[PDB]
């Protein structure tokens, strides 16, 4: 039983020990929910949630003073692991059965099953092992101090003219130099990230339409919902009551119902920190021409040269990694739920279980003068301590802790 965390320079060794405790059935099943697959009698070990290795204090100590982090290696101690990645990878689908956030909790091993190719798991050579993470880019555990459209000098004009007038105040052609008072019209080098426009739903349920548009108005791809879809800002300035219908990660409060969970019983994650580069999910990407001139509002915008976009934030309760599918090609192989897209993720391991992960940190060197924004617990007294057991002994996570709190320049 180790369940410790050691901070050594740019490294942090987060180990956790948990006490742990079926049926091959041909399972199968609206046309969008049909499936076919196999229910194996095997249980699999899952530790693909950040709270399985980081304590809330560890998460604070990580997100308050590090611009980035990425796993380096893991040691697992306890049955076989698919080191060659033959079995279907059910990890990274944000499923339950992970190690409990509280080290004192005893969890049961989730049953393993896959979808379709029949895979007999006794056809494998079946304790401790070590895995080394491939070089994955650092997770951007920071916000941007500057917006993409405000990277210019607010004092000097541009030497490039923009067409400012087409009609005398007869039609003509007039040009003006971009300046501090016309920042919208200044020539710029970069475009906001790609957009896959989503429906706007208000947490103030009165403002929403009187219809059941959770699915009909969804942002599904062809029909499965693009949940949470590409990384986009949840809302614009002073619009925290709004969120994309299926474009954010929503976590469950303790004892929340599996279905029909009320808004008070769930925790919404706000991706507003990426609004400096990523377009708001509920709003359009921009306006293009169509032909009197005609303007077309572009809602779904693909990748364009010069685009820059932030990935979706990771959370203490959120997934850590996801296997990049072994496809011929891909664009920006990063999980949409957030995390580290690994071509060779930690093998799924099909008593007590100990998992230790070494995370490399990116120490921040910011010359920003004013104090930063840090994650803090409310000083005001409460009935129960946040991120602690209650009277009945049930450890609960009150809020979804984000990861981008320090700031950086674009």
């Amino acid at each position: 039983w180790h369940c410790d965390s050691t901070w050594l320079g740019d490294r942090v060794i987060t180990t956790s020990t948990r006490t742990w405790a079926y049926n091959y059935k041909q399972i199968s099943n609206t046309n969008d929910n049909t499936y076919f697959g196999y229910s194996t009698p095997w249980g699999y070990f899952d530790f693909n949630r950040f709270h399985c290795h980081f304590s809330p204090r560890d998460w604070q100590r990580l997100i308050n003073n590090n611009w980035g982090f990425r796993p380096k290696r893991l040691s697992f101690k306890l049955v076989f692991t698919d080191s060659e990645y033959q079995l279907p990878y059910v990890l990274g689908s944000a499923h339950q059965g992970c190690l409990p956030p509280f080290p004192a909790d005893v969890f049961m091993i989730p049953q393993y099953g896959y979808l379709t190719s029949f895979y007999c798991l006794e056809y494998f050579p079946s304790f401790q092992f070590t895995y080394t993470f491939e070089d994955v880019p650092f997770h951007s555990s920071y916000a941007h101090s500057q917006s993409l459209d405000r990277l210019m000098n607010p004092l000097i004009d541009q030497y490039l003219y923009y067409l400012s007038r087409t009609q005398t105040t007869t039609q003509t052609l007039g040009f003006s130099q971009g300046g501090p008072n016309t920042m919208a019209n200044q020539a710029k080098n970069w475009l906001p990230g790609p957009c896959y426009r989503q429906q706007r739903v208000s947490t103030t349920t009165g403002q929403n339409n009187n219809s059941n548009f959770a699915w009909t108005a969804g942002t599904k791809y062809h029909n499965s919902l693009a949940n949470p879809g590409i990384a986009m800002a949840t809302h614009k300035d002073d619009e925290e009551r709004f969120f994309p219908s299926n474009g954010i990660l929503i976590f469950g409060k303790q004892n929340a119902a599996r279905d029909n969970a009320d808004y008070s019983d769930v925790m919404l994650t706000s991706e507003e920190e990426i609004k400096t580069t990523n377009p708001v999910a509920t709003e359009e990407y921009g306006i293009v021409a169509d032909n009197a001139p005609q303007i077309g509002t572009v809602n779904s915008q693909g990748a364009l040269p010069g685009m820059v976009w932030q990935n979706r934030d990771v959370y203490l309760q959120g997934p850590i990694w996801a296997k990049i599918p072994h496809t011929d090609g891909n664009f920006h192989p990063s999980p949409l739920m957030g995390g580290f897209g690994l071509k060779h993720p930690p093998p799924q391991i099909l008593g007590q279980v100990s998992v230790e992960i070494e995370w490399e940190l990116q120490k921040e060197n910011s010359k920003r003068w004013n104090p930063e924004i840090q994650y803090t617990s409310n000083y005001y007294k409460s009935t129960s301590v946040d991120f602690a057991v209650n009277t009945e002994g049930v450890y609960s996570e009150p809020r979804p802790i984000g990861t981008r709190y320090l700031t950086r320049n674009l």
């Binding site: 103030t204 349920t205 009320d262 008070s264 005001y380 007294k381």
Partner: protein, 345 residues
């Protein structure tokens, strides 16, 4: 005006209001710090027959302090009016209980000019006084227990809660069986009477005559006719108006006066101008429905599943909207705009 009343200044203000007019000043209990809960009776002591009790409880949340000041000013104005017609008749036919502060501890802990948009909202134990009542859907809140005992000791028929953070008149059933935060409209058996009372209070207010409050936080909460249901507005588990409607027979309505909970004292006079009429109207709205005598006897109205009980002297004050009703006693009556119809049993 232009001054808040603090420890031993609330008591002094109530004593000078009593001297200005008649008035009995007493305490229904003590707060956590032993601060007395001052109540001024305008008419401790015996309960006079034929007097419909009206209690006006303000400053439930310590940071909500317009209620405290307007309660003090209303007591002073009522005493002056009786000493000097409308107020004379109101104090001669109605027993009015004035409770400027149910949470003196929070009021002391409140800060200057916070406006709401830690703060003293809860009592000294951190327990909300508006979330410490039994709900149809102690010992840590002595103020709540004291008010519960005070209500049990009397037969209040109409009451008004004065709050802050909004400008609206909310009527009972601030909670819902499904306990959804907003949207769900919880309707009572006496919903029409509650709506009439809230409308009567809000019409005189120079702000609640328009449902929109024009204050930070909502900017679009256009309440219909300046009144709303508590559950329809925002759910409150264990509120006091619902308790007063259920465990008591009182008709209790919450009244958010201003969206700035703790305005600077210079605004107080203005706030007084916004409420001086309205409060009085609310009190003079207790003379509606029917009134009569029969001794712990159940009084009911056909078509409504809410039965009241006669007072110690058989007196019952069934608040009603004008109309024809079938009265029933367990142990056609016309209601017109104005004085309560006298029916005897």
């Amino acid at each position: 005006f232009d001054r808040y009343y603090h420890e031993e200044e609330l008591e002094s203000a109530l004593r000078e209001a009593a001297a200005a007019g008649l008035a009995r000043l007493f305490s229904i209990g003590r707060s956590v710090e032993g601060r007395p809960l001052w109540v001024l009776r305008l008419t401790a002591g015996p309960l006079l027959p034929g007097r419909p009790q009206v209690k006006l409880v303000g400053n439930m949340h310590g940071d909500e302090t317009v209620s405290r000041q307007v309660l003090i000013y209303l007591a002073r104005e009522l005493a002056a009016g009786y000493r000097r017609p409308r107020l004379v008749r109101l104090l001669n036919t109605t027993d009015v209980y004035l409770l400027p502060s149910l949470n003196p501890d929070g009021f002391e802990r409140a800060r200057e000019g916070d406006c709401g948009f830690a703060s003293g909202r809860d009592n000294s134990r951190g327990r909300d006084l508006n979330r410490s009542f039994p709900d149809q859907f102690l010992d840590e809140v002595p103020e709540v227990r004291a008010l519960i005992e005070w209500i049990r000791r009397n037969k209040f028929v109409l009451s008004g809660n004065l709050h802050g953070g909004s400008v609206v008149a909310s009527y009972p059933f601030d909670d819902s069986p499904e306990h959804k935060a907003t949207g769900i409209y919880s309707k009572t058996s006496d919903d029409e009477v509650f709506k009439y009372l809230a409308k009567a209070y809000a019409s005189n207010h120079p702000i609640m005559k328009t449902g929109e409050p024009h204050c930070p936080g909502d900017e679009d909460e256009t309440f219909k006719d300046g009144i709303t249901n508590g559950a329809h507005w925002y759910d409150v588990e264990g509120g006091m108006q619902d308790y007063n409607y259920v465990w008591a027979n009182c008709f209790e309505i919450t009244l958010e006066l201003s969206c700035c909970k703790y305005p600077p004292a210079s605004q107080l006079r203005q706030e007084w101008e916004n409420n001086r009429e309205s409060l009085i109207t609310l009190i003079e709205k207790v003379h509606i429905g029917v009134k009569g005598f029969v001794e712990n006897a159940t009084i009911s109205v056909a078509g409504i599943n809410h039965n009241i009980t006669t007072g110690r002297f058989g007196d019952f004050y069934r608040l009603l909207v004008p109309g024809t009703y079938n009265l029933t006693v367990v142990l056609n009556v016309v209601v017109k705009e104005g004085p309560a119809t006298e029916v005897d049993f």
